[PDB]
Amino acid sequence: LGPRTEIANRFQSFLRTFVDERGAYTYRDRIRRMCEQNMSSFVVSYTDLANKEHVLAYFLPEAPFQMLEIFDKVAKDMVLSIFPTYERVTTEIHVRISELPLIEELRTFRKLHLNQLVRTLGVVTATTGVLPQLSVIKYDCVKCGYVLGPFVQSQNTEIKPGSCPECQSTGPFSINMEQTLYRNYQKITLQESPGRIPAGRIPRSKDVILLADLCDQCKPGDELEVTGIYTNNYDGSLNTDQGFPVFATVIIANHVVVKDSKQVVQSLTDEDIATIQKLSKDPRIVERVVASMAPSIYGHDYIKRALALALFGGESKNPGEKHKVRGDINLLICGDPGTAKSQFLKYTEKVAPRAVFTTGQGASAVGLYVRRNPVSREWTLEAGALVLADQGVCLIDEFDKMNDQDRTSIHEAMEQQSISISKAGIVTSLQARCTVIAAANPIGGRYDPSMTFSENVNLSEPILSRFDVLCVVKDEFDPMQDQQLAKFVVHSHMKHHEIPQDLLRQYIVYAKENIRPKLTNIDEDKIAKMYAQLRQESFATGSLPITVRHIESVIRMSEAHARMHLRENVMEADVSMAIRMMLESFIEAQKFSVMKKMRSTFQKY
Amino acid sequence: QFKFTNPTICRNPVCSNRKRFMLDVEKSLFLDFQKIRIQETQAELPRGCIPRAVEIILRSELVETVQAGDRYDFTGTLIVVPDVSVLAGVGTRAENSSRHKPGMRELNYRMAFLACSVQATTARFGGTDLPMSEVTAEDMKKQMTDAEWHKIYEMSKDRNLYQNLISSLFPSIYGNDEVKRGILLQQFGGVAKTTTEKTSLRGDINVCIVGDPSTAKSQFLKQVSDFSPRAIYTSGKASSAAGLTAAVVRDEESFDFVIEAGALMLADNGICCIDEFDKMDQRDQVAIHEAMEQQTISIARAGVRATLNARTSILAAANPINGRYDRSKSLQQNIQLSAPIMSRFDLFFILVDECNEVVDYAIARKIVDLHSNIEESVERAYTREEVLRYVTFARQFKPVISQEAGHMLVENYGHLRQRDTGTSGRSTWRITVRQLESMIRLSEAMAKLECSNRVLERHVKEAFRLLNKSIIRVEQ
Amino acid sequence: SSNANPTNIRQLKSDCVSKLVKIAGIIVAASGISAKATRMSIQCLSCSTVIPNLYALPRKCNTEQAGRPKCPLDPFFIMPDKCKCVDFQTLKLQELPDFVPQGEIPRHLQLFCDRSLCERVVPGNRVLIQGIYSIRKVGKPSRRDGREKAVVGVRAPYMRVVGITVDSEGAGAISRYSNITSDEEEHFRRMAASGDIYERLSQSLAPSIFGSRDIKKAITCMLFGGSRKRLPDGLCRRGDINVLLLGDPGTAKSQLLKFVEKVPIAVYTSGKGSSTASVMKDPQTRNFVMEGAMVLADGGVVCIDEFDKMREDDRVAIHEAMEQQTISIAKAGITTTLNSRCSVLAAANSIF
Amino acid sequence: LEAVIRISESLAKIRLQPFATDEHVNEALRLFQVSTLDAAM
DNA sequence: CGATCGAT
DNA sequence: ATCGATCGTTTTTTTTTTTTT
Numbered sequence A: 001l002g003p004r005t006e007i008a009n010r011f012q013s014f015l016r017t018f019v020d021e022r023g024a025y026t027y028r029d030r031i032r033r034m035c036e037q038n039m040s041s042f043v044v045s046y047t048d049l050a051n052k053e054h055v056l057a058y059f060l061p062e063a064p065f066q067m068l069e070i071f072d073k074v075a076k077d078m079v080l081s082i083f084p085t086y087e088r089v090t091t092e093i094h095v096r097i098s099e100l101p102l103i104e105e106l107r108t109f110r111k112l113h114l115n116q117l118v119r120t121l122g123v124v125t126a127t128t129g130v131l132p133q134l135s136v137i138k139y140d141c142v143k144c145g146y147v148l149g150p151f152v153q154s155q156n157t158e159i160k161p162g163s164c165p166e167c168q169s170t171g172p173f174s175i176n177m178e179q180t181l182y183r184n185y186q187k188i189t190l191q192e193s194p195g196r197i198p199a200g201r202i203p204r205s206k207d208v209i210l211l212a213d214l215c216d217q218c219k220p221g222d223e224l225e226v227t228g229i230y231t232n233n234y235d236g237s238l239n240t241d242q243g244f245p246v247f248a249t250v251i252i253a254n255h256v257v258v259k260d261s262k263q264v265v266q267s268l269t270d271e272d273i274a275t276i277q278k279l280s281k282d283p284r285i286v287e288r289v290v291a292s293m294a295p296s297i298y299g300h301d302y303i304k305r306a307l308a309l310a311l312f313g314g315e316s317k318n319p320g321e322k323h324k325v326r327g328d329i330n331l332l333i334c335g336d337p338g339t340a341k342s343q344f345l346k347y348t349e350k351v352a353p354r355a356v357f358t359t360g361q362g363a364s365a366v367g368l369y370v371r372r373n374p375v376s377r378e379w380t381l382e383a384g385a386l387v388l389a390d391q392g393v394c395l396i397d398e399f400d401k402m403n404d405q406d407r408t409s410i411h412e413a414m415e416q417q418s419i420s421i422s423k424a425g426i427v428t429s430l431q432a433r434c435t436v437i438a439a440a441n442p443i444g445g446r447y448d449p450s451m452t453f454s455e456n457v458n459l460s461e462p463i464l465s466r467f468d469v470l471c472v473v474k475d476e477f478d479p480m481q482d483q484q485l486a487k488f489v490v491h492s493h494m495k496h497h498e499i500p501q502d503l504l505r506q507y508i509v510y511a512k513e514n515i516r517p518k519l520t521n522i523d524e525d526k527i528a529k530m531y532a533q534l535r536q537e538s539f540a541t542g543s544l545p546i547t548v549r550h551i552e553s554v555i556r557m558s559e560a561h562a563r564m565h566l567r568e569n570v571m572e573a574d575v576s577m578a579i580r581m582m583l584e585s586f587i588e589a590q591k592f593s594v595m596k597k598m599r600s601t602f603q604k605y
Numbered sequence B: 001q002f003k004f005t006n007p008t009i010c011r012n013p014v015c016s017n018r019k020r021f022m023l024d025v026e027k028s029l030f031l032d033f034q035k036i037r038i039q040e041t042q043a044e045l046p047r048g049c050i051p052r053a054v055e056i057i058l059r060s061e062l063v064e065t066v067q068a069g070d071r072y073d074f075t076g077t078l079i080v081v082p083d084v085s086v087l088a089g090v091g092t093r094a095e096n097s098s099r100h101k102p103g104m105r106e107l108n109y110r111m112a113f114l115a116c117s118v119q120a121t122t123a124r125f126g127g128t129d130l131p132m133s134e135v136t137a138e139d140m141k142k143q144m145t146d147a148e149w150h151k152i153y154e155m156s157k158d159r160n161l162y163q164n165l166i167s168s169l170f171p172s173i174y175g176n177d178e179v180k181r182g183i184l185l186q187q188f189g190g191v192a193k194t195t196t197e198k199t200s201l202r203g204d205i206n207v208c209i210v211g212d213p214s215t216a217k218s219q220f221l222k223q224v225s226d227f228s229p230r231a232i233y234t235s236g237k238a239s240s241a242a243g244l245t246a247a248v249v250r251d252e253e254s255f256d257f258v259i260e261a262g263a264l265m266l267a268d269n270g271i272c273c274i275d276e277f278d279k280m281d282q283r284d285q286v287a288i289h290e291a292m293e294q295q296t297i298s299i300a301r302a303g304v305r306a307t308l309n310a311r312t313s314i315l316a317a318a319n320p321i322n323g324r325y326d327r328s329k330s331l332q333q334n335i336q337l338s339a340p341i342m343s344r345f346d347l348f349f350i351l352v353d354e355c356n357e358v359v360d361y362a363i364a365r366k367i368v369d370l371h372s373n374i375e376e377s378v379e380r381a382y383t384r385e386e387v388l389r390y391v392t393f394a395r396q397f398k399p400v401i402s403q404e405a406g407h408m409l410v411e412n413y414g415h416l417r418q419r420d421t422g423t424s425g426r427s428t429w430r431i432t433v434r435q436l437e438s439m440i441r442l443s444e445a446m447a448k449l450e451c452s453n454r455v456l457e458r459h460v461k462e463a464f465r466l467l468n469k470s471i472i473r474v475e476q
Numbered sequence C: 001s002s003n004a005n006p007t008n009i010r011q012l013k014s015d016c017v018s019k020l021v022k023i024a025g026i027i028v029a030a031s032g033i034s035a036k037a038t039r040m041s042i043q044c045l046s047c048s049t050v051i052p053n054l055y056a057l058p059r060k061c062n063t064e065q066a067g068r069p070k071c072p073l074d075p076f077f078i079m080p081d082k083c084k085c086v087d088f089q090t091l092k093l094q095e096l097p098d099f100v101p102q103g104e105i106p107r108h109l110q111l112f113c114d115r116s117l118c119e120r121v122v123p124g125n126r127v128l129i130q131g132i133y134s135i136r137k138v139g140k141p142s143r144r145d146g147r148e149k150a151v152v153g154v155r156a157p158y159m160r161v162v163g164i165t166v167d168s169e170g171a172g173a174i175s176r177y178s179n180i181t182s183d184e185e186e187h188f189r190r191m192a193a194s195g196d197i198y199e200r201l202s203q204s205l206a207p208s209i210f211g212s213r214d215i216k217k218a219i220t221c222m223l224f225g226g227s228r229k230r231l232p233d234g235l236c237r238r239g240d241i242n243v244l245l246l247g248d249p250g251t252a253k254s255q256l257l258k259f260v261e262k263v264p265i266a267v268y269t270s271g272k273g274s275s276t277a278s279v280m281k282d283p284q285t286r287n288f289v290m291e292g293a294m295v296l297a298d299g300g301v302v303c304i305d306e307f308d309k310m311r312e313d314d315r316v317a318i319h320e321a322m323e324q325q326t327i328s329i330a331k332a333g334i335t336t337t338l339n340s341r342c343s344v345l346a347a348a349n350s351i352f
Numbered sequence D: 001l002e003a004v005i006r007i008s009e010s011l012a013k014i015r016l017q018p019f020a021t022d023e024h025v026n027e028a029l030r031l032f033q034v035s036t037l038d039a040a041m
Numbered sequence E: 001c002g003a004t005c006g007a008t
Numbered sequence F: 001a002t003c004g005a006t007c008g009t010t011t012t013t014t015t016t017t018t019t020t021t
């Protein structure tokens, strides 16, 4: 119409007219960037939409279907007109939204929400696999032997015209298995979280549809935010009825968003993206990373730096067919039952890309061994959480007073980084590439004197094998420090109403994702003399089987340092920093005779 | 109609009378209900037959306000139920065999019931903008949130109301006068800061009772379930570890594994205290070892991304080894328990028993006004209505610290650890920053008593006094 | 056949359908050998019924030469004296171990065959494939499926094979058949002729590992097996061979057993769990079949650590199998003393 | 003995000579000697 | 046992 | 419009093995 033509014109005079990011708008070029990677999932801003023209907030809910259609039509008519080069591969488009100032929890949406604009979240549960449906209606005539032809399709409705090449005849027909258009499919079953329940009763759930563009992203137990829209199967068998219609409700997804989203993710500011390389190459940045660990503690540089390096360190370095070495480490702090340790862990999660929360006393380490049937409706399936979170983290707290039948069980995945099961209808296997939280508790009351460590907490012989970042919150009283930190504490309790967390998140996404460091011969013989310094100074006193894993953890520190620099190679610096930290620690966990490598390394130092 | 029939004959034309148009879900008439079941009256509990159950339905506005454990008042809309099929109804069957001149469905109807009114009584509390028995229709922040300022100012102004209120809820009780002033601070608010994305900051505080036998440490709390909202009590062995957890299932009802709630766990912003903390098994014990401090907890073996959370404080019920406080062993051997929880609990207040005749006869002199059925209790200072309303108001204030004792809580705490620099030679003890955290919110709440913001160094000094009380009380 | 490129299951999609392809997966198990044919006659018409697809059966009688007393309403007497017979086996397919199993699990696919690719694939093998991605059923409109199924049109997947082949991961597929040539066997025997082969073979598993050479003079002798020197009485004296090892960690037991898996047929789990043996009950027809997984070492070998770290409810059937090689069964209505020649390697961990 | 027989058998399997001599198996003797002298204490 | 469908 | 001859029509089961705490 005069006005009903102006919808597409508003989109056209939007996507190259409303401009921000200091000129050269996204939707001038963001669409180009969609065509580049061959995605066909352009996404729109409702914020920016209202910043241009508020009008299409009320012109949506009367039929958001037709709004979305009349948009993606514009995307085609622009793309293939200026990118006719595109017109081979897919040549079909639909668009998305990611700005809705609302979260509807479940148990919140009712008959008023019918077939219009929606948002909600939840948790995934078991659902279907990967299937397609149809997309176009065409059959085959047999009275005249012709084709009925292709016919305009309604969402779940018949057409059956008389018009066809068979003298517009041949009411009967048959159908082929080709020359017709297809469309992937997958389903979901959404549950609500165990935090935002009505505090103690059974939860609610409804189902949700995802479509051909949208599959193989979800999984059981994943984090999520979706617009979706409210559905209605228009008849779940109306007749002489129950005391109630047997109706149901679904949501169909337009734009799904993961709320973990552990990939390389963010867009680029036009200039505020070299935020890295205005600063990231300075020499003082060895220690500026420490200032953003956990802004909580006055002391404790050591564990600060250890977690700081090990949050993004890692190298696969798969040699020929032998094995896959490590994207792994097990730093451990066996401190005091009540020095603040369990708080150290949380900021890790609140920055780092993956996780799950688990505390000590988990399962029997089996996990919630199924045989695969369509009896019991599929006999639900998983094996742990390092199966569920690989190349990331999933959390432990207060371990050391747990079932020995778990300390057994986890004792391969750390290092072989491999799972392998049996004891079902299956013996398949699966990948566990992870690292490990620590968070345990000592025995003997609080913490021992410098008297030996094997006496401090009593774990069995074939678990002793691996070990790492050995720190400990040994305590003795300084009143000056008590004054300093307590000022800091009350100051911390006085905030009523160098690095921000705003950025370094992305630095480490970038750092452990893209750059892939190395090593070269510089001084790798010195390592042997220091290993000998272990074996000669430490034989039966302290040297508690610290075999050929922690040594290689030496390399892990060095590679960790250079990725903290985005260096990819190094001189004596990084390795010597590893030697500095290890030299400190293994003096830490001795006897009152505490200075063995100390005396041994003033020449090294 | 309930019995639904797409088939309609015609309106304007002579046209199809079984061939229908398509459907309208767009501009037409829709609505909502749910469906639940109901058991026999617990006010009408006869012998013999079962709890005959009724079917029940709810219209729009009635919805999601029914709930387990609740009694109601319905409509009386008993039904002819447009049912579709059933067995065993082998009575006579009929249908209209029309006029002879020159579709079928078996008929056996069942019963259900419908209702369009609810007063879910015995489940109704109301916060503070509800006008109570005693009110003062005045202007305020909200409707009735403190519109009895006309008195609550007075109940927030006296230097006597501290002790009067300490004595305005123990009329039928007599013992020490330290828990009689400390225990309310458990029910009284904490800190409530407005601050950063560092981590959840807590308002509540751990609280304990120990004492010799038959001291009515139970009767302190037997009433508390009747007292506070959200804060209903039972024991820990009053259920299983389906108190903390739910009842662990291994049979198929909906998806064959269900542990998603508990009994401790549904006490959100009320306390559900427990008795008998000494002989209970070490399962919920190590659960509480972090569930009180790090109120963000998980499980495995059946987890739908298990992340649960405690919310309130606690009340303890210890008793010694021999039943008596025979000073023949250290406290660590007197109770035979662990360290960190003896530090996690920043407040002890043990109730010790003796034998002096005047005391016991004075108790019986309490009893003089326990069965004098007119005047079977002692005088008071402040009625309950105004009391709880002042309590319900005194939170909404944003407590604050800018005080030199806030600056020099460093001083009092430096002295706290100066005098506690020892506590290491004769039966060593441990100091820890949970003590500081607890003193902080303690001082803060002690000024929240004032119906005022902005901490004062009086509160620090009394808090220091009370911490000194507790720690020297820990002395053997 | 071709050498174009292998694809991955994560992309086998609605575009990739009715279309020739190439992949590379791995095999799990697949069916027995049922039946299929192409055409047949019927007495009602006496014509070999010719079909394009590999059902409609129309109305008219064709025993109409009865006068006016004809036989309508589909009177079809299938004459399998006159029918045919080809094969049908339903091969299977799991996806790779590196191609989106990472934050997920691996899916898989089921297959099909007609004539000569039965007796072609034993499961637990690495394939290269050319097949085709197509369906079995059809329909979009509001004839919505089942009871509460099919919002619109979901039909099912599978593939049929047009020209499976196999893998050459060095010797990817060298397990049962022989496409090997006289040059190969000359090579073999002339290395056997070489009297410097065993000590050279003491250095085949440790090209990155040091030491343990007296330890390794028979770590591979395990693999070859000796002799199943059976006798006319019972005394089938024990064929295969078994080994123990245990000691301080930090000494490369795990990687070594991974390699002994690497170097024809083998598997690895360890504790807490290959294989009671498995008597299930068929969800189709509810019969009690036996999947029965040392069967997958029926000539291969086994390696495990974690004998120590798994309880004794499951050690005894395997305590026993490896003295008689006959997996017994007596549980439900079956007494099928199964058997299979597996060995085993035993690593361990001593407490103290 | 019932197993060391299989060690001889493995050796002859390698070199393909069918009939195996005791010098071929002195190697076997020295290898299970590891087990003997292990459980020697 | 029900609807389709043809003619009278 | 009416009657009659045409077309097409189908539903029944309970229990055993391994697994997890």
Ligand SMILES: Nc1ncnc2c1ncn2[C@@H]1O[C@H](COP(=O)(O)OP(=O)(O)OP(=O)(O)O)[C@@H](O)[C@H]1O
Residues within 6 Å of the ligand: A296, A297, A298, A336, A337, A338, A339, A340, A341, A342, A343, A398, A440, A441, B289, B290, B293, B294, B340, B433, B434
């Ligand atoms: N530098 C600090 N900043 C803030 N809080 C601190 C600091 N040092 C100690 N704490 C406090 O000490 C308390 C330690 O208890 P936390 O919740 O950490 O349990 P935990 O120490 O992990 O004990 P456990 O692991 O034995 O259960 C925390 O409340 C923490 O706030």
Ligand SMILES: Nc1ncnc2c1ncn2[C@@H]1O[C@H](COP(=O)(O)OP(=O)(O)OP(=O)(O)O)[C@@H](O)[C@H]1O
Residues within 6 Å of the ligand: A323, A325, A415, A416, A462, A465, A548, A549, C208, C209, C210, C248, C249, C250, C251, C252, C253, C254, C255, C256, C349
């Ligand atoms: N002597 C060695 N030479 C070369 N690499 C070694 C040596 N010893 C160990 N390594 C390396 O150290 C790692 C040892 O891990 P592995 O899983 O073998 O532990 P383990 O010896 O099996 O201990 P456990 O039996 O307690 O698991 C391997 O990745 C291996 O490559």
Ligand SMILES: Nc1ncnc2c1ncn2[C@@H]1O[C@H](COP(=O)(O)OP(=O)(O)O)[C@@H](O)[C@H]1O
Residues within 6 Å of the ligand: B172, B173, B174, B175, B212, B213, B214, B215, B216, B217, B218, B219, B363
């Ligand atoms: N000061 C008091 N006020 C009221 N009742 C008291 C007081 N002192 C003791 N009692 C009575 O003593 C009894 C104490 O028993 P209780 O302490 O509950 O047993 P237990 O020692 O097993 O907890 C209570 O029934 C209570 O009525």
